[PDB]
């Protein structure tokens, strides 16, 4: 009944930075929210723990969740390799939005991005499923290690992750 909350403890070249928490909109996109929740807890035997944010573009977004190829070409969901676009009820309204990365229609896996700006051109193309609840300061700090082309100057990792409450 209560939307679940998940957390990521972020490190920069192995050094703790801080924690980002997210509210997952299970009330509006339950199947997508559940995939991210389970990847965050690792309860299916695979997930986000130890993965990195491989592409960070200041003023745009930080992208991660590729735990099979570590570069933006991999990932898999709890439902199989890919899963469908659940719905496009929620929009990319500004910094803090959590949304699914994809490679075309109906190709969601495990990759996700956190908006650091409004990305309205993505509406109806990428499934929005959550928002940052605490630690937008930590996202902003992360963002400073990106670049115009997305390559990061230090390695930004999810050192730990899980479910709160």
Interface with ligand L99 (CB under 6 A): 72-73, 75, 101-103, 107-109, 111
113 classed as catalytic: yes
The residue from 35, 67, 126, 129 that is catalytic is: 126
18 versus 72: smaller Cβ distance to ligand L99: 72
The residue from 22, 53, 83, 113 that is catalytic is: 113
122 classed as catalytic: yes
75 versus 95: smaller Cβ distance to ligand L99: 75
Residues 6+ apart with CB under 8 A from 22: 5, 6, 7, 8, 98, 130, 131, 132, 133
3 versus 32: smaller Cβ distance to ligand L99: 32
The residue from 46, 70, 87, 102 that is catalytic is: 102
145 classed as catalytic: no
112 classed as catalytic: no
Catalytic center residues: 55, 60, 63, 102, 113, 122, 126
């Amino acid at each position: 009944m209560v939307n679940p909350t998940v957390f990521f403890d972020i490190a920069v070249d192995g050094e703790p930075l801080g924690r980002v928490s997210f509210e997952l909109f299970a009330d509006k996109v339950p199947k997508t929210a559940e995939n991210f929740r389970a990847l965050s807890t690792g309860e299916k035997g695979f997930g986000y723990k130890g993965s990195c944010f491989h592409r960070i573009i200041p003023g745009f977004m930080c992208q991660g969740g590729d735990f099979t190829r570590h570069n933006g070409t991999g990932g898999k969901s709890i439902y199989g390799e890919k899963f469908e676009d659940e719905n496009f009820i929620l929009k990319h309204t500004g910094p803090g939005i959590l949304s699914m990365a994809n490679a075309g229609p109906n190709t969601n896996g495990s990759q996700f991005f956190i908006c650091t700006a409004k990305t309205e051109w993505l509406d109806g193309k990428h499934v929005v499923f959550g928002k940052v609840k605490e630690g937008m300061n930590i996202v902003e700090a992360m963002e400073r290690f990106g670049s115009r082309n997305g390559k990061t100057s230090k390695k930004i990792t999810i050192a730990d992750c899980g479910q709160l409450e």
